[PDB]
C-alpha cells in the first residue's frame, strides 16, 4: 500500500558551491496502488526556502515551490 518513505538528500552529494543554504532537505518519495491504472504518486507538496547564487556572485533567497513531498496517494 502507498507509503510516504522519508528520503533525505545532500548538495555536495549532487551544488554545494551553488546553494548557500540549506545543506540538504528532507525530500521523501512515494507503494502499491490497485485498479483505469493507479500509481503511488505524490498528492501533497511543500515549498522550501533557499539561499543560493543568481548567476555571477548574486545572492538570492526565494521560497521554491513543490520541492518537498508531503503526502502520497493513488493516481
Amino acid at each position: 500500500i502507498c507509503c510516504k518513505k522519508q528520503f533525505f538528500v545532500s548538495f555536495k552529494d549532487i551544488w554545494n558551491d551553488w546553494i548557500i543554504a540549506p545543506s540538504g532537505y528532507h525530500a521523501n518519495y512515494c507503494g502499491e496502488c490497485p485498479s483505469l491504472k493507479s500509481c503511488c504518486v505524490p498528492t501533497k507538496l511543500r515549498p522550501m526556502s533557499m539561499l543560493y547564487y543568481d548567476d555571477g556572485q548574486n545572492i538570492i533567497k526565494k521560497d521554491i515551490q513543490n520541492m518537498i513531498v508531503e503526502e502520497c496517494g493513488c493516481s
Binding site: 543554504a21 540549506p22 545543506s23 528532507h26 526556502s49 539561499l51 545572492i59 533567497k61 521560497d63
Partner: protein
C-alpha cells in the same frame, strides 16, 4: 501564531527593495516559520548580505538564537525560530 523578522538586503537598490526594517512572515496553515541572517565575515569586518523570513527548515528547529554553524564558509548563514530572532547573530 504570527512571526515577524528583521529584513535586510545589501543589494536593496538594484532589487528595488527597502534596505531594512521588519518583514512579517506569512506561511503555511500549520507549518513553522523561522528567520535567517546571511553575511560575510571575511576581513574581521562583517558584511550583511541578507536577513529575512524562512519557511519551515529543520536546521532552524527550536533554535532561539541565530548561530552560523559551518566552519569558515565564504557566506555565513544562521537559522532561528521566534520573532526578530535574527537581529543578533554569531558563529560557533
Amino acid at each position: 501564531e504570527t512571526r515577524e523578522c528583521i529584513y535586510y538586503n545589501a543589494n536593496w537598490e538594484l532589487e528595488r527593495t527597502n534596505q531594512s526594517g521588519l518583514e512579517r512572515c506569512e506561511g503555511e496553515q500549520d507549518k513553522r516559520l523561522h528567520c535567517y541572517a546571511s553575511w560575510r565575515n571575511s576581513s574581521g569586518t562583517i558584511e550583511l548580505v541578507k536577513k529575512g523570513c524562512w519557511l519551515d527548515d529543520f536546521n532552524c528547529y527550536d533554535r532561539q538564537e541565530c548561530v552560523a554553524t559551518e566552519e569558515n564558509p565564504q557566506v555565513y548563514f544562521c537559522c532561528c525560530e521566534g520573532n526578530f530572532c535574527n537581529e543578533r547573530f554569531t558563529h560557533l
